[PDB]
Amino acid sequence: VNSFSGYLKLTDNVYIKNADIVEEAKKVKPTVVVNAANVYLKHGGGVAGALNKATNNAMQVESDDYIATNGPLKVGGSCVLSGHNLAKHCLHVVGPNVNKGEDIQLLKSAYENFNQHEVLLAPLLSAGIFGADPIHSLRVCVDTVRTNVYLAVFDKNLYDKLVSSFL
Ligand SMILES: CN(CC(=O)O)C(=O)c1ccc2[nH][nH]c(=O)[n+]2c1
């Protein structure tokens, strides 16, 4: 038993809710919140901008130190950093950005990072400003992640379409 509430169960291990991941994180304090990161951990907009703003920019400060030490992530890769006031940990995961021409097949590799964590609160990778089809992203999620994932979908209209079209 865990503290996530109001989720629709899609599969044995994947759940989905129309929610703001920031507000969801501040209420649940999950062990892991996933950020839709880029390779530079520059949290300017989308989910990343929103999560970082909710940390009063502490996420960005920590991220800049991480990059200064380690260099950029790989597309499809991840790193674990602090969750600040939102979660114990933040798993920063880089899905391919279609608006940068990155290969969509890397989306499966991105979701594989979730399997290193038993339970996660997450957005749909490569959705929103990353330019992928959220229905495809949901399919890859279900077909790749084996651990327990709670997907927060900000847009109610999109949440309805994702549910209604789910196979
Ligand atoms: C795919 N999407 C949008 C969605 O879930 O429909 C996201 O990843 C997302 C979630 C929350 C959020 N707050 N501000 C944002 O830009 N933003 C973006």
Swiss-Prot record:
Domain of life: Viruses
Cell compartment(s), UniProt: Host endoplasmic reticulum membrane
Domain Macro: 1-167
Region of the whole protein represented: 1025 to 1191 of 7096
Regulation: Inhibited in vitro by GRL-0617.
Name of this chain's protein: Papain-like protease nsp3
Its biological purpose: Responsible for the cleavages located at the N-terminus of the replicase polyprotein. Participates together with nsp4 in the assembly of virally-induced cytoplasmic double-membrane vesicles necessary for viral replication. Antagonizes innate immune induction of type I interferon by blocking the phosphorylation, dimerization and subsequent nuclear translocation of host IRF3. Also prevents host NF-kappa-B signaling. In addition, PL-PRO possesses a deubiquitinating/deISGylating activity and processes both 'Lys-48'- and 'Lys-63'-linked polyubiquitin chains from cellular substrates.
Membrane topology annotation: Multi-pass membrane protein
Mutagenesis or variant effect for residue 164 to L: In strain: Gamma/P.1
Leader sequence residues: none
Catalytic reaction(s) noted: Thiol-dependent hydrolysis of ester, thioester, amide, peptide and isopeptide bonds formed by the C-terminal Gly of ubiquitin (a 76-residue protein attached to proteins as an intracellular targeting signal)
Subunit: May form homohexamers. Interacts with N protein.
